[PDB]
Every structure is written in structure tokens, then in C-alpha cells.
Amino acid sequence: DLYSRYKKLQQELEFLEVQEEYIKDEQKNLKK
Amino acid sequence: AVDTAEQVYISSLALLKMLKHGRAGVPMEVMGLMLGEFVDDYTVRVIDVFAMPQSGTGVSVEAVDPVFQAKMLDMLKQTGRPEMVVGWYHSHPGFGCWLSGVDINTQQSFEALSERAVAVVVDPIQSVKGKVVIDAFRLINANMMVLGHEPRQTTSNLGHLNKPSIQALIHGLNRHYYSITINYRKNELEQKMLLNLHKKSWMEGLTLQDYSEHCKHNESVVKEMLELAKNYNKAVEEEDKMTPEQLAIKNVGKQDPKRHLEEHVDVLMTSNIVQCLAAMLDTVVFK
Amino acid sequence: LSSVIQNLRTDQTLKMIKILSGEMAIELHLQFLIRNNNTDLMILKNTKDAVRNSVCHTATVIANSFMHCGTTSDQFLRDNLEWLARATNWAKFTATASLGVIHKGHEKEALQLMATYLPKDTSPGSAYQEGGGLYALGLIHANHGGDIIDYLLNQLKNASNDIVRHGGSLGLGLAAMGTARQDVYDLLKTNLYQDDAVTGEAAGLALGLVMLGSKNAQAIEDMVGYAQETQHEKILRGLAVGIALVMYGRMEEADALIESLCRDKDPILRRSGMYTVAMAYCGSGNNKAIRRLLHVAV
Amino acid sequence: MIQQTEITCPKVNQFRQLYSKVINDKHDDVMAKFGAILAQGILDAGGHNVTISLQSRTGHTHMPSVVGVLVFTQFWFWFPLSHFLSLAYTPTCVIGLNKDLKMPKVQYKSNCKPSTFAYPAPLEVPPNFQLLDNPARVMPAQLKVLTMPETCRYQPFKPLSIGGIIILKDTSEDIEELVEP
Ligand SMILES: [Zn+2]
């Protein structure tokens, strides 16, 4: 289980980072 | 062999000829004819819009001069491009858009002579703030009384672009005529050159707005911000703490907490930054 | 499967052809659907009677076709024939399309059933009947090569009107979906070069079907070479899905083409490239795709 | 919501009367009730026998179940594009066809921790060991709570744990029960 979780924590980290960019990206563009 | 959902292709210079002619005689119901090209069954285009010499009658079939138009159309065959009329227009400054008592008759005379002849209504006294209420319409026959009007078949854009308001469905919608959607034929070789000649300044982007009135503007704003700060002081020290969340929501002012507090403060901050940075750059450049 | 059955032939030999081509798997599925059935009739009546003189006959006949897909039962085209034939111009088109949807898969029985409605003998002045018929024959005979691709080929070579050139090419493209035959590819090109602005969505959908996941070196160029100088929006939208459907799962082999469609100022082509980047990326957690897909959304 | 019962999620009958309320109302849009009449046909598609899935049996993806749904997304611009959604209709049968024609009628059951679900009955209002034959549907979520017959000698070769098609490793003599309508 110690190898199976470690990629899963990467996938949750990578899925988070595209989101938190995009919500910073949208809220920059939402001001117009 | 029936309509589904037509789309009117107007050009950029078409609407510009519409507003200037509509603004020209506002209290005299300007009247002209619309010239385009039927390209297929249910898309229609119009690029070139000319005006008609008006009369004492006003918007009617009698103000449409036949001998002037054919003299005009013949002279347009050699210069530019020859094509056939596809409709007409008039202006209703007194109200919104609906087909008047004689507008429906001259519609019948045009769709009996030409094919379908879409009529455009532009309100010049309304096209003021940032928007125009231009709308075009098209007559349906009175023979389809047992079938539902607007024979839509394979489309779902009809819920868009306008819904029929209360001021529209009272006169003739939908039992006499129907509404039509109009999009804007935008392209290159028109759009960027309109922006670069209207909203563009070369020498103005590096001026200095000399500091007689500039630092003077940084003084009338400090005083009213101070009084708002003292008023902001007055509310923050006050702090009603009997039922706070209901007292806060039934007593809002929309000017005390952060409305008038950082609005002018932001404006004075950005202005001197732009002014000093433009002042520093010219000192870097000019020797 | 088309590759191995060419390598296989290079009795138990005839048995292993049929189970690697697939006739009985259609049949036992067809046997499964004709046995088991649960469709209530009352609800369809309570939806039927609340329909006014609007356009909702197409909405009904698309609904029953969805809930009788493969059931192969004709009851609504039998109990009220006059109510179905009330509306026109596409309601006869959609219903005879829906007749094929209920008979999803016979591979012979629908061909001998719909042999009654010939495309020269139904009505001389109703091409929506024969056009929806050739559309319906393409729905039933899908992913099944043979004479039917060639038999629908001979009918498109001699077409009467442009209504029939819709459901003919839509029927032919779905029959040849994933085949990449040169003959259907040659006639679908010259159909697009006919320059007719009612059938571009008929040709544009069909060209993506016969070239589904193909990455041709000339199809994408000829489609994006055609959809610049035209003058309609259907012809933009027909080729829009076709250049999206031509690639499927390339995963790095469209990235310049995705950039080529998105940098363009064409709103349809920017819309079309969003489908193409979606179809090349399926089940794939590419962060850079969804970064680029969301940044262009807002 | 496809082949789902009340024990699967409670909002089904909530949504069925909601579909009904917007389709029996007169003062609505046609575009509103077009969504409801479409919701009627998708909820009961194929008589609770077919379902939609981009996913195949063994991790592979379908091509025609993707082509069907994406042209269905273009239903604003052309209404007969909705016919193409039928390609994504996938069966939920489990047929134990061992020979090219031999369809024996093997009576297998399942083992549900609650009581019965899985193929409701039509309305008209103006144990957990139920045996099942080979041409019978199965809910795609009860594929792991089933059980092949251990009291019968006829046992399959592939382990029955996922809906699809399997064979019956015939072991006895004197085979019978063939039926085709
Ligand atoms: Zn008027």
C-alpha cells in the first residue's frame, strides 16, 4: 500500500495545482 | 418549403448608415431601403444601406420613389457592385419596435414584389448609453391559423438573442409577425483599424499633465477622505454589541465601511504612480 | 479485427472467422432484446395528449426511439398513423429515422422489411421519406462492412435531390465508420467540392466518420484549406466536427494542429479545436491539457 | 440516472414527478418541456436493458460510445443528430452460450444484503436468492454480489464477476433445454 498511495498523493497534488491556478486565472479575468 | 430560423448578416457600415440617418431627422420619421443579397434559403446578408428622399407623408409606400431608386440602382451597377433589395427600414423614435398601421401594408407590398423583405426598426433616441435596440421583423401569413406560427424545426438558438418582452408581444407578436435574430459580420481588415484610429493616442501616452492642477488634485481629496476616516472612526469605536448580526444587516449604509474609504485612496495612489513613473522615464530618456 | 481476419486466412476455420467478425453477438443481443422488455404505454399516452399544436412530434418520436432502441416493436406507427403524419418537412424525416432506431440491428431482416420503401417509389415529391430511409439504413447497418457500403455507394452516385444527399452520406459514413476506404473517401471529397450550402454538414460529419482516428496527411489540410474562403456557417460547422472526429487519441500528435486552430480568429475553428483536443485526450490526466483547456475557457 | 431504483438513490421518484410536473404544465416553454420529454426516453431507454458507458469491459475505451455522445452534444444545431446517441447503448446481459447454438437455461441467483431491486414494474395510477436464466439482465453494480450455482455441476470457465458474455464448461452428459422464439 506504501507505493500505491504515493502516486495518489501526486495525482491529488497535480489536480489541485491546475485548479488553484485557474481560479486565480478566472478571478483575474472576472474583474473586467 | 417553409421558414425555420433565418439569420440576418449585417455589415459594419450598414448599421453606421442606419444611426446617422436616424439621428439626422429624429422628429420626422426617416425612411430608406435596405439592399443586400439572398445567398440561400435561410441565411440573408446586407452590406450596403442607402437612404431615400422623404416626403410630407412620412413612412409609407408613397415616400418610396420608384424612378429615383431605379436611377440610383443603375448608377450603383457600374460602381461597387450590383445587387437586389432585400428589405427596407424606418425609424420609430416615439416608442420601441413594432410594425405600424401602414408599415404592415408596405411590408405586404414588398414581399409580394420581392421575396421576403425583412423590415428593420431602429430607435435612435434609445441608442445612447452603450447599447442599441435595433430589431428586424418578418411577416407571417394569415393562412396558418390552425398551425402554430414560427415553424421551427432543427434549431435551439431561438431561446437566445432576445426574448419577447411585454412591450413587444402586445401589438403584433406573435399573431401577425415574428422576430428574427441578427448577428454582426466581424472580420479582419476592419476591426483592428477601427480601434487603432479611434481609441489610440501616440503623443498623449507620455505627457506630464503639469503640476499646477496635479498636486492641487491631491489636496481636495485628502479632506473628504479624512472626514470619512473620522466617520469610519466614529462607527468602529461605537461597536453596538446587542444583537450584532441583525443590527448589522438591517442597518447598512453602503458608504461607510469600505466604500468611500479606499475608493479615492486607490485613485490617488494610481495617479501619482503613473505620473511619477512617466516623470522618471523621461529623465532616463532625455539626457 | 479487420487486420487479424486478413492475417488469419493467410469447420473450425470458418467458425473462427464468424466469431472474430461478429454476427451471432449481434444476434444473441437481438435475441436478448426481443425476449426481455419493460416499456409502459400509459406514460407515453400522458405525454402524448398534453401536446398542443406546437412542434413536439419530433420530440415524441425521438423519445420512443430511445426507449424502444433494439426492442423492434412497431406500435406507435400503427395505432395513430394520422397523428404522426400531421406535421411536416422534418417530422416525416425524423419518424422514418426513428423507425430505424427501434430496429437497431437485424443485418438482414430490416433490409427485407425496409425494402418496401424504395428510394424511387415512396413519393416523387417527398425526399424526406427516402432521405430519412437511407439515414435509417445507415443507423441499422453500422460497423458492418459488405455490400451495403457498396450498395449505398451506387445510390449516392445517382442522387435525385440534396435532401437525399444528407441521409445518404450520413448512412454511408456510419456504415464505413472506421474503415478508411479510398472510394468513399474520393466521393466524399468531391461531394464537398460540389460547393452546395445545405449538404456541407452532411459531408463534414461523414468525412470524420470514415477517417475516425486516422491522421491523414491530406484530409486535415484539405478541410482547413476549404473552410477559409467559403461564405456560410453550416459549412463551417460541418467541417468543424469532421476535423475533430478525424483524430482520436493521438496524445502528442495534434499539439501543433490544436495550436493552429486556436490561434486563428475564427470562432467556429477555435470552437472546433476544443473538440479536437478533447477527443485526442480521453481518460488522460494531462495537466497541461486541462491547464490549456481552462485558460482558453475564461 | 439509468437503470436505477429507489434503493439506489432517493431522488428518482423526486425527479420523475418533477419531469411530470413540467410536462403536464401548460404555461412553460417548449424548450423547457423538450428537456423533459427527452428525459423520459433516456431514463427508460431500451426497456431497462441497455445503458451508456464510455468504458468497456476490460479497461479499454469504446470508440462508438464516444462518437455517439459528442455528436449528441451538437443537438442545438441539428435535431436529427440525437439519433447517434443510440450507439452508446450497451447491453447488461450475461449469457452462458458455450457452443455456437447451445443456450442452456441455467438458473443462477444472487446474494443481496438488502431485499430485492433490479428491474422495477410499470405503474398504473390514473428472500434474496432469486434465480435467473441466461437471457436475463443484471444491474451493473450487482455484478460482484452475485453467485454462480454451486449445487449444479455446470460451472463456467471464466469467473462470473462482470457483466458480459461467458461460456459454460459442460461437464455432464445428456444436455437439453434449447429454446429460440
Ligand atoms: Zn414603423
mmCIF file of all heavy atoms in Angstrom, chain B residues 42 152-160, chain D residues 29-31 34 75-80:
data_model
loop_
_atom_site.group_PDB
_atom_site.id
_atom_site.type_symbol
_atom_site.label_atom_id
_atom_site.label_comp_id
_atom_site.label_asym_id
_atom_site.label_seq_id
_atom_site.Cartn_x
_atom_site.Cartn_y
_atom_site.Cartn_z
ATOM 1 N N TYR B 42 -32.214 30.213 -45.925
ATOM 2 C CA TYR B 42 -32.449 30.772 -44.604
ATOM 3 C C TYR B 42 -31.218 31.423 -43.991
ATOM 4 O O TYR B 42 -31.096 31.473 -42.762
ATOM 5 C CB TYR B 42 -33.038 29.703 -43.681
ATOM 6 C CG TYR B 42 -32.196 28.471 -43.462
ATOM 7 C CD1 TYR B 42 -31.415 28.339 -42.326
ATOM 8 C CD2 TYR B 42 -32.240 27.407 -44.356
ATOM 9 C CE1 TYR B 42 -30.665 27.201 -42.107
ATOM 10 C CE2 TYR B 42 -31.492 26.268 -44.149
ATOM 11 C CZ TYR B 42 -30.709 26.170 -43.023
ATOM 12 O OH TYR B 42 -29.973 25.030 -42.817
ATOM 13 N N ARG B 152 -40.458 26.356 -36.373
ATOM 14 C CA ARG B 152 -39.087 25.996 -36.066
ATOM 15 C C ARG B 152 -38.963 24.483 -36.158
ATOM 16 O O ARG B 152 -39.898 23.752 -35.821
ATOM 17 C CB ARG B 152 -38.655 26.510 -34.683
ATOM 18 C CG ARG B 152 -39.196 25.757 -33.465
ATOM 19 C CD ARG B 152 -40.600 26.183 -33.117
ATOM 20 N NE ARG B 152 -41.110 25.478 -31.954
ATOM 21 C CZ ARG B 152 -42.393 25.457 -31.623
ATOM 22 N NH1 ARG B 152 -43.270 26.103 -32.377
ATOM 23 N NH2 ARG B 152 -42.798 24.790 -30.553
ATOM 24 N N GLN B 153 -37.851 24.017 -36.720
ATOM 25 C CA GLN B 153 -37.677 22.578 -36.846
ATOM 26 C C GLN B 153 -36.421 22.024 -36.175
ATOM 27 O O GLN B 153 -36.509 21.108 -35.362
ATOM 28 C CB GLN B 153 -37.709 22.172 -38.321
ATOM 29 C CG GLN B 153 -39.103 22.196 -38.965
ATOM 30 C CD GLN B 153 -39.469 23.519 -39.605
ATOM 31 O OE1 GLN B 153 -38.608 24.327 -39.933
ATOM 32 N NE2 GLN B 153 -40.764 23.744 -39.789
ATOM 33 N N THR B 154 -35.241 22.553 -36.518
ATOM 34 C CA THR B 154 -33.984 21.911 -36.121
ATOM 35 C C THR B 154 -33.079 22.914 -35.426
ATOM 36 O O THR B 154 -31.858 22.927 -35.603
ATOM 37 C CB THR B 154 -33.276 21.307 -37.330
ATOM 38 O OG1 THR B 154 -33.154 22.295 -38.363
ATOM 39 C CG2 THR B 154 -33.998 20.081 -37.855
ATOM 40 N N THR B 155 -33.678 23.755 -34.597
ATOM 41 C CA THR B 155 -32.875 24.818 -34.021
ATOM 42 C C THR B 155 -33.148 24.949 -32.534
ATOM 43 O O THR B 155 -34.260 24.709 -32.060
ATOM 44 C CB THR B 155 -33.126 26.148 -34.740
ATOM 45 O OG1 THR B 155 -32.375 27.181 -34.096
ATOM 46 C CG2 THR B 155 -34.604 26.511 -34.765
ATOM 47 N N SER B 156 -32.111 25.337 -31.810
ATOM 48 C CA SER B 156 -32.253 25.641 -30.393
ATOM 49 C C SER B 156 -31.608 26.959 -30.004
ATOM 50 O O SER B 156 -31.410 27.192 -28.809
ATOM 51 C CB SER B 156 -31.669 24.515 -29.539
ATOM 52 O OG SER B 156 -31.713 24.866 -28.169
ATOM 53 N N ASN B 157 -31.253 27.814 -30.957
ATOM 54 C CA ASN B 157 -30.771 29.159 -30.689
ATOM 55 C C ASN B 157 -31.902 30.164 -30.489
ATOM 56 O O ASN B 157 -31.635 31.315 -30.134
ATOM 57 C CB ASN B 157 -29.859 29.612 -31.833
ATOM 58 C CG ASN B 157 -30.536 29.524 -33.199
ATOM 59 O OD1 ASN B 157 -31.704 29.156 -33.312
ATOM 60 N ND2 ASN B 157 -29.803 29.880 -34.241
ATOM 61 N N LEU B 158 -33.150 29.752 -30.713
ATOM 62 C CA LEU B 158 -34.285 30.663 -30.668
ATOM 63 C C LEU B 158 -34.596 31.172 -29.268
ATOM 64 O O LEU B 158 -35.168 32.258 -29.140
ATOM 65 C CB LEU B 158 -35.516 29.981 -31.275
ATOM 66 C CG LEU B 158 -35.990 28.630 -30.730
ATOM 67 C CD1 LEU B 158 -37.029 28.736 -29.612
ATOM 68 C CD2 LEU B 158 -36.526 27.813 -31.876
ATOM 69 N N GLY B 159 -34.217 30.435 -28.224
ATOM 70 C CA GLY B 159 -34.323 30.944 -26.873
ATOM 71 C C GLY B 159 -33.327 32.023 -26.534
ATOM 72 O O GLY B 159 -33.457 32.686 -25.501
ATOM 73 N N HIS B 160 -32.337 32.222 -27.398
ATOM 74 C CA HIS B 160 -31.309 33.230 -27.208
ATOM 75 C C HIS B 160 -31.621 34.500 -27.987
ATOM 76 O O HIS B 160 -32.670 34.610 -28.634
ATOM 77 C CB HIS B 160 -29.960 32.683 -27.662
ATOM 78 C CG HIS B 160 -29.464 31.527 -26.857
ATOM 79 N ND1 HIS B 160 -29.946 30.247 -27.024
ATOM 80 C CD2 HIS B 160 -28.476 31.440 -25.935
ATOM 81 C CE1 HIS B 160 -29.311 29.429 -26.205
ATOM 82 N NE2 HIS B 160 -28.406 30.126 -25.541
ATOM 83 N N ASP D 29 -42.136 26.889 -21.331
ATOM 84 C CA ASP D 29 -41.552 26.936 -22.655
ATOM 85 C C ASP D 29 -41.585 25.562 -23.307
ATOM 86 O O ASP D 29 -41.628 24.524 -22.641
ATOM 87 C CB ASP D 29 -40.112 27.438 -22.610
ATOM 88 C CG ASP D 29 -40.026 28.914 -22.338
ATOM 89 O OD1 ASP D 29 -41.003 29.628 -22.643
ATOM 90 O OD2 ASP D 29 -38.971 29.363 -21.844
ATOM 91 N N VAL D 30 -41.573 25.573 -24.639
ATOM 92 C CA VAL D 30 -41.414 24.333 -25.382
ATOM 93 C C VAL D 30 -40.011 23.790 -25.176
ATOM 94 O O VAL D 30 -39.822 22.579 -25.016
ATOM 95 C CB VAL D 30 -41.738 24.570 -26.869
ATOM 96 C CG1 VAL D 30 -41.512 23.309 -27.690
ATOM 97 C CG2 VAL D 30 -43.175 25.050 -27.022
ATOM 98 N N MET D 31 -39.018 24.683 -25.120
ATOM 99 C CA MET D 31 -37.640 24.292 -24.851
ATOM 100 C C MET D 31 -37.484 23.713 -23.449
ATOM 101 O O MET D 31 -36.611 22.868 -23.221
ATOM 102 C CB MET D 31 -36.729 25.503 -25.041
ATOM 103 C CG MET D 31 -35.243 25.214 -24.982
ATOM 104 S SD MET D 31 -34.267 26.708 -25.197
ATOM 105 C CE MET D 31 -34.548 27.026 -26.937
ATOM 106 N N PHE D 34 -39.188 20.271 -23.824
ATOM 107 C CA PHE D 34 -38.375 19.425 -24.689
ATOM 108 C C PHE D 34 -37.323 18.692 -23.874
ATOM 109 O O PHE D 34 -36.959 17.553 -24.183
ATOM 110 C CB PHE D 34 -37.717 20.246 -25.796
ATOM 111 C CG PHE D 34 -36.920 19.424 -26.756
ATOM 112 C CD1 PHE D 34 -37.555 18.634 -27.694
ATOM 113 C CD2 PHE D 34 -35.540 19.434 -26.720
ATOM 114 C CE1 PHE D 34 -36.832 17.866 -28.585
ATOM 115 C CE2 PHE D 34 -34.805 18.670 -27.607
ATOM 116 C CZ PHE D 34 -35.456 17.885 -28.544
ATOM 117 N N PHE D 75 -26.760 18.943 -30.515
ATOM 118 C CA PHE D 75 -28.189 18.881 -30.768
ATOM 119 C C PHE D 75 -28.826 20.256 -30.862
ATOM 120 O O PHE D 75 -29.972 20.342 -31.305
ATOM 121 C CB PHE D 75 -28.888 18.067 -29.677
ATOM 122 C CG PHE D 75 -28.993 18.775 -28.359
ATOM 123 C CD1 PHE D 75 -30.200 19.337 -27.953
ATOM 124 C CD2 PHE D 75 -27.911 18.825 -27.495
ATOM 125 C CE1 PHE D 75 -30.308 19.981 -26.739
ATOM 126 C CE2 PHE D 75 -28.013 19.473 -26.276
ATOM 127 C CZ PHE D 75 -29.219 20.050 -25.897
ATOM 128 N N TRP D 76 -28.136 21.318 -30.431
ATOM 129 C CA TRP D 76 -28.631 22.661 -30.683
ATOM 130 C C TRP D 76 -28.670 22.995 -32.159
ATOM 131 O O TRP D 76 -29.596 23.677 -32.608
ATOM 132 C CB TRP D 76 -27.769 23.728 -30.010
ATOM 133 C CG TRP D 76 -27.979 23.895 -28.557
ATOM 134 C CD1 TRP D 76 -28.756 23.141 -27.739
ATOM 135 C CD2 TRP D 76 -27.480 24.968 -27.758
ATOM 136 N NE1 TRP D 76 -28.729 23.639 -26.460
ATOM 137 C CE2 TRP D 76 -27.952 24.769 -26.450
ATOM 138 C CE3 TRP D 76 -26.659 26.060 -28.022
ATOM 139 C CZ2 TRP D 76 -27.632 25.637 -25.403
ATOM 140 C CZ3 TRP D 76 -26.333 26.922 -26.990
ATOM 141 C CH2 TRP D 76 -26.820 26.699 -25.698
ATOM 142 N N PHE D 77 -27.707 22.509 -32.926
ATOM 143 C CA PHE D 77 -27.517 22.987 -34.278
ATOM 144 C C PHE D 77 -28.188 22.111 -35.316
ATOM 145 O O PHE D 77 -28.352 22.550 -36.459
ATOM 146 C CB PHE D 77 -26.017 23.094 -34.572
ATOM 147 C CG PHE D 77 -25.313 24.096 -33.712
ATOM 148 C CD1 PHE D 77 -23.995 23.896 -33.343
ATOM 149 C CD2 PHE D 77 -25.987 25.194 -33.201
ATOM 150 C CE1 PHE D 77 -23.345 24.798 -32.526
ATOM 151 C CE2 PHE D 77 -25.345 26.100 -32.389
ATOM 152 C CZ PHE D 77 -24.021 25.901 -32.049
ATOM 153 N N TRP D 78 -28.597 20.903 -34.935
ATOM 154 C CA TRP D 78 -29.294 19.992 -35.834
ATOM 155 C C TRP D 78 -29.981 18.945 -34.976
ATOM 156 O O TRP D 78 -29.318 18.253 -34.197
ATOM 157 C CB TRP D 78 -28.323 19.349 -36.806
ATOM 158 C CG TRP D 78 -28.971 18.557 -37.844
ATOM 159 C CD1 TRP D 78 -29.009 17.204 -37.941
ATOM 160 C CD2 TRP D 78 -29.699 19.066 -38.955
ATOM 161 N NE1 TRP D 78 -29.709 16.832 -39.062
ATOM 162 C CE2 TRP D 78 -30.149 17.963 -39.700
ATOM 163 C CE3 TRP D 78 -30.011 20.353 -39.397
ATOM 164 C CZ2 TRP D 78 -30.896 18.108 -40.863
ATOM 165 C CZ3 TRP D 78 -30.749 20.494 -40.545
ATOM 166 C CH2 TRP D 78 -31.182 19.378 -41.269
ATOM 167 N N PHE D 79 -31.298 18.836 -35.103
ATOM 168 C CA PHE D 79 -32.023 17.928 -34.216
ATOM 169 C C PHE D 79 -31.885 16.437 -34.549
ATOM 170 O O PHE D 79 -31.835 15.637 -33.607
ATOM 171 C CB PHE D 79 -33.512 18.287 -34.123
ATOM 172 C CG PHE D 79 -33.809 19.468 -33.247
ATOM 173 C CD1 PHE D 79 -32.800 20.226 -32.679
ATOM 174 C CD2 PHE D 79 -35.116 19.728 -32.878
ATOM 175 C CE1 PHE D 79 -33.093 21.291 -31.847
ATOM 176 C CE2 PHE D 79 -35.421 20.780 -32.039
ATOM 177 C CZ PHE D 79 -34.405 21.559 -31.517
ATOM 178 N N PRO D 80 -31.804 15.978 -35.833
ATOM 179 C CA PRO D 80 -31.530 14.545 -36.044
ATOM 180 C C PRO D 80 -30.144 14.042 -35.653
ATOM 181 O O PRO D 80 -29.845 12.864 -35.869
ATOM 182 C CB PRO D 80 -31.747 14.368 -37.549
ATOM 183 C CG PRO D 80 -32.714 15.375 -37.892
ATOM 184 C CD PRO D 80 -32.388 16.561 -37.061
#
